[PDB]
Amino acid sequence: HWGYGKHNGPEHWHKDFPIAKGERQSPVDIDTHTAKYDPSLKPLSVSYDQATSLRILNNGHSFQVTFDDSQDKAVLKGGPLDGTYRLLQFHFHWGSLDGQGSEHTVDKKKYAAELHLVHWNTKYGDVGKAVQQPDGLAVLGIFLKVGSAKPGLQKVVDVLDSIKTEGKSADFTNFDPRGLLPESLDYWTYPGSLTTPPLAECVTWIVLKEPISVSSEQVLKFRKLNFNGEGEPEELMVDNWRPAQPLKNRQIKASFK
Ligand SMILES: NS(=O)(=O)c1ccc(O)c(NC(=O)NCc2ccncc2)c1
Ligand SMILES: [Zn+2]
Numbered sequence: 001h002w003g004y005g006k007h008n009g010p011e012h013w014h015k016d017f018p019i020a021k022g023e024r025q026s027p028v029d030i031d032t033h034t035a036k037y038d039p040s041l042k043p044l045s046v047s048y049d050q051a052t053s054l055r056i057l058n059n060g061h062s063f064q065v066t067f068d069d070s071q072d073k074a075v076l077k078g079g080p081l082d083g084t085y086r087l088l089q090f091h092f093h094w095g096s097l098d099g100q101g102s103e104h105t106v107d108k109k110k111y112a113a114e115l116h117l118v119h120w121n122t123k124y125g126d127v128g129k130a131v132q133q134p135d136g137l138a139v140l141g142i143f144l145k146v147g148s149a150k151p152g153l154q155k156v157v158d159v160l161d162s163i164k165t166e167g168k169s170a171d172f173t174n175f176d177p178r179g180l181l182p183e184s185l186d187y188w189t190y191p192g193s194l195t196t197p198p199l200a201e202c203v204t205w206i207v208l209k210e211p212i213s214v215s216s217e218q219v220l221k222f223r224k225l226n227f228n229g230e231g232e233p234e235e236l237m238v239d240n241w242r243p244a245q246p247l248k249n250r251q252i253k254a255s256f257k
Contacts, residue, residue: 045076
């Protein structure tokens with residue numbers, strides 16, 4: 001029912017998900033001058049060495065690669081996290097044009113896309129219990145800009161033709177998530193929400209300072225995807241991003257001076 005068009009887009013979501021006007025909603029603009037360097041933060045430790053990708057799926061608002069999370073195979077720990085968070089999926093948000101597409105903004109600058117890597121707190125047992133917890137989820141957000149091609153993205157790009165419309169999935173084994181990470185792991189962090197319905201306020205956002213670059217041909221193939229399912233009017237999947245929400249009583253902390 002909810003979507004990203006004029007009639008079902010982010011400005012209507014509060015009618016079905018009243019938490020959309022809550023206190024810790026996401027995304028936000030990261031004012032880099034008002035973020036506080038916090039030395040009490042630990043380095044991010046990404047242990048994706050034994051990650052097990054399963055499928056890629058068009059869910060009708062994005063495409064999503066899923067992982068086997070029944071074991072500590074790909075985990076995130078450190079940073080502002082307490083405990084161990086298992087990788088569950090990643091997905092992308094992107095625009096119709098290269099000057100918009102990201103959900104988070106940095107000094108009001110929008111990037112061409114955003115990669116979201118979704119992890120959940122193992123102490124809660126499964127992901128459906130974690131999403132009801134104030135600290136149940138950790139999302140690692142990575143900006144994409146348009147420049148040179150990114151090799152570790154090309155395997156995703158090559159299969160997009162197989163999942164063009166909503167509900168299609170394809171096998172997607174032996175994918176390495178480390179190929180999507182920038183060279184530096186400097187980050188901002190703040191407590192937030194999911195950026196799509198149901199917009200649960202369960203996320204510790206970790207947003208990386210350094211973007212990854214992708215080529216225009218690579219992003220062009222993202223925009224060839226469809227919101228609709230097969231046998232329907234053709235709606236290209238673009239501008240699947242929520243606009244920035246007020247920070248309200250929240251401080252953004254930085255891991256880097
Ligand atoms: N962009 S995000 O903050 O990293 C993010 C991370 C994990 C998520 O699960 C979502 N949200 C969904 O996956 N919503 C599907 C759904 C829609 C309506 N009813 C039930 C389920 C957003
Ligand atoms: Zn997302």
